[PDB]
Amino acid sequence: LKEVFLMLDNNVVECIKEITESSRNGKLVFFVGAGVSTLSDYPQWWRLVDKYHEELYGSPYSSDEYLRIPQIFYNVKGEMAFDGILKDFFQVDKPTNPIHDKILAMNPAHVITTNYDNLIDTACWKRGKYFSVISAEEDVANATSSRYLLKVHGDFRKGFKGENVVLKEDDYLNYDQNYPLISNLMKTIIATHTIVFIGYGLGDYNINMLLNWVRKLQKDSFHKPFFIRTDPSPIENETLIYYENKGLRIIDAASLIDSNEYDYLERYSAVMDLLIESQENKFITKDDEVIDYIYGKISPLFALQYIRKIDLKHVFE
């Protein structure tokens, strides 16, 4: 890892820098996708689609088929059957993977997630972090804390019901209509904080929607969000530039380390562990860097005529 940091690309180390400074400043927000939840063996949505498909046609997928078959099942089988399959599939207990702990160890100001599980919730309670968990419209006004655990797609705390969550089509279609405060809160958090996307694919629907809204913003009015890519293959150079111009700052796990095709946990950890250990590290190697770091600590003190030497231990922490 220290060796891995030594030949890290200059862009990645710079990306590691801004993430770390934001974590210290208390303005880091993690956008956690289903990939992190899948690491904890949570029931993936594709098997929910498979079950809905089996109960519809009798025999077991494009992007809209993930949204259409649940919508077809909801229309013709009803709300009880849709939630009945939801309950017997999602009412399970799953342990929090170490990535959930590593996400909290970054000390995020807020945690935005599209997961409807409570894995981050129980991870937060085990760690001891307090987050005001918001998954519905009323929770925004009744939030008791500044730190938000924003489940933009809802969860099953109220119950294993389809209305509590954004699963099928006509939930993504009417998302802005049924979640105006939650969508506003998510956009406000993204505008004012530095965002790291983790557990998301580069072609994920939510990433495109957020990138679609980002293009509406004026140039350089927003901080470019950070994306942790954990796909088994290295990202293509042409795809990378496309998403960087869209507004994402991509950190590619497959480029950082050599890993197996199905070993996602090591891919997630290699970026999380590199992020965690960069918190103490000063990224200090050359003499020009050494003067730059000491100057940053000392230059504000130039306003003062004299500094107590015993006070200098606070300047350098």
Add this chain to the structure above:
Amino acid sequence: SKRYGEKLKEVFLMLDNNVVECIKEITESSRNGKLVFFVGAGVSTLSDYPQWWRLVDKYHEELYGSPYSSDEYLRIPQIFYNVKGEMAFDGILKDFFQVDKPTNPIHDKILAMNPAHVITTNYDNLIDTACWKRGKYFSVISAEEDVANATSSRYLLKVHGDFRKGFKGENVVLKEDDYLNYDQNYPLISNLMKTIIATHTIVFIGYGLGDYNINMLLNWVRKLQKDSFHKPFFIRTDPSPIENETLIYYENKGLRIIDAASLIDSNEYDYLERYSAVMDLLIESQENKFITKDDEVIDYIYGKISPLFALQYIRKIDLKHVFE
């Protein structure tokens, strides 16, 4: 030929009541001059027009050097348009689409059904060519400036543009950005399309039930008041018969599906006869090839003649016009 006529007569005889009603309503709208065809890429494919997946294949080749979900068909062209120049995108468009193709018999059948307008998502000139030969003039509208200066009453509205101005990407709705900014870039085209759908009887042909345009239109149809519109007819020509659940799902969304696979038996890759089964059912229903009982004869002649009961006498030279 003759055996096809006999088989078609048999198919119509065993046709389901709902399908018979759909055919009758379509023919009545054709007679009324209120019929509009919404032609998809399946009809253009039936003439071996280069499908978009080959274009995405070439874009992927030029992008990564190696050779698709629903998002990919729109994203990979956008990837190419961004990382590469507009000139390369337009050059690939030109070398793939600057071809001439024959007009398939489905084009001729569509025009023989006498459509008041023809809306199409195809950027080819195949429907233009078919319209031109039959002697019926259609005001082709493919750009924004074409809406205002529309010459005639009949519009051939290409909602996704075409290559009449040139083989350039800005004239067509191909990549992901074009679909995102379609409403802003095509206000008048979209408005005209929606008005034609609202005021006419629409028949979708050449589309899959999971098509982007079909889903978008059904999304707009949701916003309308209940029973404020006429349900468009959908001619489904997929190899396998439509599932009952999918059928009821899409019928409750505001579609009247005529499933070609459910009407006739055909081979999996045999699309042309699946299109021709429905088209010919409609046409020979128009040509009265399907009436066989004396009750139908009296009903047809009464429908032609009963309005003339208001008049006292009718010239025999006009009775020829009454029966076309």
Add this chain to the structure above:
Amino acid sequence: KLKEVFLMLDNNVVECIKEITESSRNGKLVFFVGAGVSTLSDYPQWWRLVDKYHEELYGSPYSSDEYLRIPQIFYNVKGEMAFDGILKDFFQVDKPTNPIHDKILAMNPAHVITTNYDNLIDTACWKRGKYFSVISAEEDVANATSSRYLLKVHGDFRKGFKGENVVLKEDDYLNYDQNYPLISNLMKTIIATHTIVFIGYGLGDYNINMLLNWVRKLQKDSFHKPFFIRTDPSPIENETLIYYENKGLRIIDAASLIDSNEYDYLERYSAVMDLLIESQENKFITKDDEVIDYIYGKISPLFALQYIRKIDLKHVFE
């Protein structure tokens, strides 16, 4: 006088008249009729309704937004039943049609779009013998019996004198796009495909500015500029004219045309309407250049043919 005022017309006014008459001959003329034509027939104005709503809401008696908010408050407080009762007792009257209704019909418009919820235009069409498919509800668009529409974009009282059938209160204008998608789409299609003449609007009307806002979204030259007949008593200020003409309107001012009293709205409407009607047969030919231009416009298509029958030339020149 009509001939005399014609010989002194501004060049742009003559061009506007030429365009309007050319579109009328081609059957591509549509009249967007405002409340000014309706009040000319003494149909009750909306400010009297606002006055009654204020009198019931408060003791005794507005801003532009108040005209929509006071009815909104009265609705929300007193009830749809009370709103219905006031509308019924105020609007269930019989008023004769104006000569300007007959003038608009004599212009032979392809469609008549109107924000009026009265039946004055319907009565004029029925009297003149003009058959129009009246579209005032959402279900009327699909059931229209003809391709010539009498589009009442704000509804009317055919179904009943109920507030739900019309667009009066503040919520109606807020939810108009959600409540009237088909009617608004048809209106915008007619605007895009036809030549539009606005009559009965005050250039500061809600609907005029909303249409101008929608026109703003359209491409630079994808649309034709609608014509606006301004019949306010005072001549339009030059800066206001420049502003509204740069927004996509071609304004013909009645006050700039003839001189009349402040309250002589009938005369101001009639001046423009008769100047349009009497120009149908006129060809605007004074100089030899105009003679050659007109004859060339008639003859040049015949250059494709190798020869023309002389007896067929009477059809060329009508």
